[PDB]
Ligand binder design. Sequence first.
Ligand SMILES: *Cc1cccc2[nH]c(C(*)=O)c(C)c12
Ligand SMILES: [Mg+2]
Ligand SMILES: [Zn+2]
Lengths: 37, 136, 175, 12, 171, 144
Amino acid sequence: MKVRSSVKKMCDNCKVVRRHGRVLVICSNVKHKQRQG
Amino acid sequence: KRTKFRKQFRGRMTGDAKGGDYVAFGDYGLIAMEPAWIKSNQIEACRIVMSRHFRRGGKIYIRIFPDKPVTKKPAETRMGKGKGAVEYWVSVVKPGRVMFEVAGVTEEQAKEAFRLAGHKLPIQTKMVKREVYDEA
Amino acid sequence: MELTAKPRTPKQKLDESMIAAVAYNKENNVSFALDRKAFDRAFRQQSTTGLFDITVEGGETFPALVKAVQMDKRKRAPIHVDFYMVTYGEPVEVSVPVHTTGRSQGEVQGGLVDIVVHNLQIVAPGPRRIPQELVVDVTKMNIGDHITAGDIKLPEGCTLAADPELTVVSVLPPR
Amino acid sequence: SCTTCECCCSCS
Amino acid sequence: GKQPIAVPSGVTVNAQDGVFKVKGPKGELTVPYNTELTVRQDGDQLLVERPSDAQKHRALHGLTRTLVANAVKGVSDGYTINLELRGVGFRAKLTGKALEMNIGYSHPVIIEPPAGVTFAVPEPTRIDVSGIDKQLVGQVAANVRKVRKPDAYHGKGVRFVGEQIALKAGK
Amino acid sequence: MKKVAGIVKLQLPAGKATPAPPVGPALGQYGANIMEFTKAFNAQTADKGDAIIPVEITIYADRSFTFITKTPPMSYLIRKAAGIGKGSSTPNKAKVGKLNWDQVLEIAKTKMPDLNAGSVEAAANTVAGTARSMGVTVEGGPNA
RNA sequence: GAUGUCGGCUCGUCGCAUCCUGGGGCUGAAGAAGGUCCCAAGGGUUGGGCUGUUCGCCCAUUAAAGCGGCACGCGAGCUG
RNA sequence: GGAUGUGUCGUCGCAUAGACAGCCAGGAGGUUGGCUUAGAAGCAGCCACCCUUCAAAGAGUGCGUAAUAGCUCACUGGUC
Ligand SMILES: *Cc1cccc2[nH]c(C(*)=O)c(C)c12
Ligand SMILES: [Mg+2]
Ligand SMILES: [Zn+2]
C-alpha cells in the first residue's frame, strides 16, 4: 500500500474508489494500490 | 538569468500586471495568475524542465527575465545596514502576465511542457491559446 | 448581434452576461453594449475581418468591422470591443493573419518552419471584399528560407502596408 | 539464454 | 436503472409494510428495503418504480430490484458456490455439516456453517457451500477463502475453481 | 533434450553453417539435432546463397522437427547495387540510392507465395512501402 | 528592592515525527533474514572504559539498547 | 497538490437510419517496417508511419522476455 497525498492513475486499470470518507486507488496491479489515507 | 549590470538594490510592492500580452512568438502560452517574485533559478528549473520534454524545436519563449536584486541575512546581527548584496535575482510577474508560450509541438506535446514547468513555480497558472489581437 | 441598449450605465448588463461595445466612423458614434456569449461565439470566427449584422433594438441594421477589443487580464474574458462601421469603397486599414499550407521543405529535412509575424497588415483592403485569411506557400523553404511580404500573393488589388523585405516566416533550424 | 548474436541463449 | 422482474410461480411476495416478506420451496425468506422506494407486482411480472430520479433515489433502486431478484432465484432454486482445495496435502472432510480444513497448519481448521447454510465436499480437495440467502452463501464462503488465501507464488489455499491467479515467480 | 513440443520460428542465414550463435542452445533445448539441420537447411539455401532466408520450425516430440524455407532478404541485392554495405540512421534525411521498377518484377514473382495481395498492381504498390521507408526512391510511374 | 547557570545523582510524567515487542499493504517478498510505508505509545528500553561534560567513541551484551517536552523538568532535593 | 462528493451555469462530442459499458467472436498479410548495437521483431533509442484485402483490422495502447513469444487495445458484426 502506498500512502501518498497526491493520488492519481498509473495505467488503464486504476479505479479511483471512494469508500468511507477516503479517496483510494484500486488497480489490477497492486503496485498501483494507492491511498491518500 | 542574472542581469549584466545595473544599480544594486530595491524594495517592493504589487498591483495587477501591465506588460503581459498573450499570443506572440507562439500559438500556445502558459500564464501567471498570482502576484509573485520569480527567482532566477526558478526559471532555469522551468526552461530546462521544458527542454528535456522538447527533444528539438527551441520554440520556447521566456519573456520573464530577472530585473530585480534582493538581499539576505548575513548570519545574524542587525547592527549594520544594507546586507546580502548577492542573494538572488527575481522577475516580478503579475496576474495575466505571460512567462512562457511554446510553438510547433502539438497541443498535448505543449500541454505538458507547461504542466511540468508549472510544478516548480511559486504560483498557479493556466495555459492559453489564441485570439490575442490587440497590437502588432 | 442584436445589441439593444447603449447607455453610459452598464449595471443592467455587467451582472447579466453581456459585453459592452461602441461603433462609429465620423458620423454616428452611437454608444453601445452588446451581448456576451453572442460576440463571444461571434468575434471568434470572422475575427477582425468580418462586418456583421448590427440591428440595434428597434431595427436599424448597420455594417461594421471589429477594430480594437480590450479583454480583462487574469481572466481570458473580454470587456470592451470597438466596432468600426463598414464604409462602401474604403474602410481604412485591416489586419490579415498569416498561414501556410502543404508540407514545408525544411520540416522533414531537419528543422521546423517559423512564422516570424502571425497577423500581417496591408494597405487599402477593399470594402465588400476584405480577406478573412491569408494562405502562403512554405514548402519551397528549406534551411533558412526567409519569406517576406515581397512574396505573398495579394487577392487582386490589395496592397501591402508592412515593409517588403520583412520576414513573415522562416524555417528555424533544429536544436 | 543470454544474447542475440554471439553464442548462448535460453531454453527452459 | 432496473425494472424487469421474473417472479416465477413457486415464490410469493408480501409487500405488507417495509417488511417485504417472501415464501418459496426452499423456504420462506425476508428482505427489507426502503419505504419511499415504491414497488409492487403489476399483473404477472413485477416492478420497483421510484419517486425521484437521479442518485440518492436511483441508488436504492439499483438496490431493491437486485436484492428482490435474489429472493427469487433464492427460494426458486437456491444458491451454492464451489470452492477448490489446492496445494500439497490440502484437504477438507466433514463433521456432521462442519467443513473440516487441513491445509498445512500444524493443526487443522474446523469451520461451522451458520443457521441457514450447509457445506458439501465432493472430493477431498474441492469445496461446496450451498445455502438459501445469496448474501450468506457468499458471506460464509468468503471465510473459507480466508483460512488460507492463495500465495502469490503457487496459488495455494482456497479459490474459485476457474480462479485466475498469476504466480509472481521468485527464484 | 527433454520431452517438449510446441512451436518455433527464427531467422538464420542462407549459405552459412549453423554454429552456436544461430541455434545451439536456442532451438536445441527443444529436443532436436543441429547436425542434420546444418545440412538439410543449407541444402535448400544454396539456390539462394549469400543472404539470410527466414524459416519457421515445427516441433512434435522426441527428436522430430520440420522447416519451411522462405525468400531471402532483398536489402543485400540493392546495397550491392548502390555500392554501400551499411544502412542509414536517417531514411528521410540521408537516403541510400535509386532503382528501377524492373527490379520489382522479380520481387512479386518469388515472394508471391507470401504476397496475398490482389493482382499485380496490389503487391506492386505493396513492396514500394517497404522501399519508401528504407531509403530507396521510386522511378517513373503514372502520367508523363 | 535577585526568575540560581552546565553535568550528574533521585524522582517522575507527557508527546510522537516508534528503538523493541503487536497488527497490516507493497517489495526487486522463494524459505530464513531484510527494505519500506501504513496503524499502534501498554510496557520495556542493559552493565562498563575515556571525558565535568552534554554528546560521541570504544568493551561486552541485547527484543531493543527511541527522539524529544515539562523554567535545555527537578539545588527551599543532593552533589558541586 | 488530489479526487466519477454534491449544487448551478458553459464547450465540445459522438451517435434509434440503433452507439456506451457488458458479451461472443476477429484481428490482418508485406515486416523480426529501415535504422543503432554483444543483440533489441506494434512497446530501450533514431526515421517514417506507406501498400495490399477488406466488413475489418493502426508498422501501433500496456504488460511481458536476453530478443521470442503470449496476453488485450484502436477498426468490425450480431445480441439488447
Ligand atoms: C558477448 C556477450 C555479451 C552479453 C551477453 C552475452 N551472452 C553470451 C553467451 O554466449 C555472450 C558471448 C555474450
Ligand atoms: Mg500562497
Ligand atoms: Zn495503474
